[PDB]
Design a binder for this molecule. Sequence first.
Ligand SMILES: [Cl-]
Ligand SMILES: [Mg+2]
Lengths: 581, 12
Amino acid sequence: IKESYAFAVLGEPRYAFNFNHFDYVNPAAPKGGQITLSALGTFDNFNRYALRGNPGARTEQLYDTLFTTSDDEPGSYYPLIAESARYADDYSWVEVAINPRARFHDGSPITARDVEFTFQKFMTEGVPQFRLVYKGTTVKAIAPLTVRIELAKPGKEDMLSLFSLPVFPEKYWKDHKLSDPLATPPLASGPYRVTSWKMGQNIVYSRVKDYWAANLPVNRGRWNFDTIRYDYYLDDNVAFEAFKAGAFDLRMENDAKNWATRYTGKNFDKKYIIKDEQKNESAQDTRWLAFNIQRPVFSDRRVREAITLAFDFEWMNKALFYNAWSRTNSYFQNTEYAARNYPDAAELVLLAPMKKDLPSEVFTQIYQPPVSKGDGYDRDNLLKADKLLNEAGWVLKGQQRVNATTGQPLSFELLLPASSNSQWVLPFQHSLQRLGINMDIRKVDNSQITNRMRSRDYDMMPRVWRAMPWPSSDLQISWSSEYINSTYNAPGVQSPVIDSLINQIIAAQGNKEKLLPLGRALDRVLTWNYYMLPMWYMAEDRLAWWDKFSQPAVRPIYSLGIDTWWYDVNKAAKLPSASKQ
Amino acid sequence: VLGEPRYAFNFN
Ligand SMILES: [Cl-]
Ligand SMILES: [Mg+2]
């Protein structure tokens, strides 16, 4: 039986038990001031954990958890509600000691019974994947401030995942179904509390100035602003112009042409607005176009390959995007687990038993999305697309691509959020037309796209694959057969090859020597099957803000660290007064 | 954060 104050998914946590604060904070950061942010689309309720609805910005952060993660490590956990934990070396059980100072916003204590209540609330009224993941687990208050967690199989990551479960107050949540949207904020506990809102338009968070955990090491130097306000915009172009007029304080710029040509005006000449390009060498979010492979039009890997050949990234980057983007090419982008080289011996051991069910390129080639000459008319790529289509039974009848048996035109719908800039869409549609393929474009509002995304009610739609710094057991939610309805399986894949590799990843959790070939092997399977069409990423954060903030000397690796920023009185005094807005 | 897709439906 061991006792610890910190845990890490791989290796050891960076911060010793006696640590005072994170390397990437200023412990003396002053409190006060407001930061105003934007959000795209709309929202209709306050329950992030419901089975439906459009949850408001930041409503995933309303609650403290047992342990909280550092932002400069891939997965290290430090005390928040918990003070410590005793556990067996096989990570099949843990007893978590609750800090007696822990409180909800109404001043009532957070107890072991609240943790037990919360686990059962998610098991019985949470999203379906929760009960599937935790079917073999129990969470029990064995003393007023000690929760015991027991797993049916050794599962370090299952255990640490529950360390991030929001701890609900039973006194409130006994009267609200977890699956139902909430028209008003729930009783919560975190350092910021919703204090006003306008449904669909804005949410205002206020700093909880007697926050019980304000001086814990994980919170020192953080949560400095007195007010965090989110204003919603239906149109990113409207949001961008509002930023430049001073309507909100900080913008993450995802539009290449905006960044290249439109950060102009006397607010920039007067140096009221700062631009920063922060390069990062860590795991990267990546953009893809999901093929719904449960729909007949995309059931054939050859058709998915042909449509991928029609996506001229080199032309798009040069002509539309100021060559800002890099091509997506891995589900572990910019990490050690990306399959950037030929398979090594250990990978071949894992893959050879499944060769009957694998594309042969998994063994013979390094995955590379198509490269075009960059003029929109890459002859080699488009002739190969035509041959793949022909071989798949989709032949030309005149200028139209039709099924060689039924005569049905090859046609599919691209589902798009109306809020996003999508300058690549007509170029893609034009390239497809030149293969005889019709792509209908359907732009829909924020709530509709959320509902349709969740149900996979699309032929194709853009998806973000969030940065995964190591092959996590969470891969099963997005890819394994049993979790098909989690809302995270974008292509709709149920493959025994994927299932077996992810089962091995889970059995090898914590073991980096084993996870390295397994992650690379899984990358090969997911990429070579063309389940999605790789779009782009960039290994940098393009940020602009009104010059009213100061920052710690060190930025975290895995977050922008805006929660470590503070309102700088000296800097703000030179800006025009917010009374003009 | 580890475990988020276990707790909630996808958004955005
Ligand atoms: Cl600092
Ligand atoms: Mg289900």
